[PDB]
Nucleic acid binder design. Structure first.
Ligand code: MG
Length: 63
RNA sequence: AGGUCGAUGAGUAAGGAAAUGGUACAGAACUUGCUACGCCGGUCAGAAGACAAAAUGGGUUCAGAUUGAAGGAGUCACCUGA
């Protein structure tokens, strides 16, 4: 191995001067990915009893 | 016999530019250069098979709930009632 990092290092790699473009690249859209949030239904209250439906624990009333 | 056009091609230099020369580019062989290659490895980033769950939003549509305004023989009427 060599340890010198010269400004001569890294610019001549295949990676800069060649791009393989032939694949389809899905474009970015500002108007889709913009919105996110959380809500809780009005019946959810801190410390309510919830009914576990699908859980390995389902059928159980929980806090 | 004569005259004329044509074909071959010395020349000539008008047009043009294939051959030669010159100039400019610059892609090569060369020379300087602590690098470019690939294989494997892990991380960062991009992308991500099949069946799915949740969330958000759009086109098409379905359902359940509300509110306001105008108009009515300025609807009709009702109450109090000689
Ligand atoms: Mg790798």
């Amino acid at each position: 191995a060599r340890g010198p990092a010269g400004k001569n290092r890294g610019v001549s790699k295949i990676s800069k001067w060649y791009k393989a473009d032939d694949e389809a690249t899905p474009f970015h859209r500002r108007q889709l990915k913009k919105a996110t949030a959380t809500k809780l239904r009005n019946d959810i209250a801190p410390g309510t009893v919830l009914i576990l439906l699908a859980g390995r624990f389902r059928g159980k009333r929980v806090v």
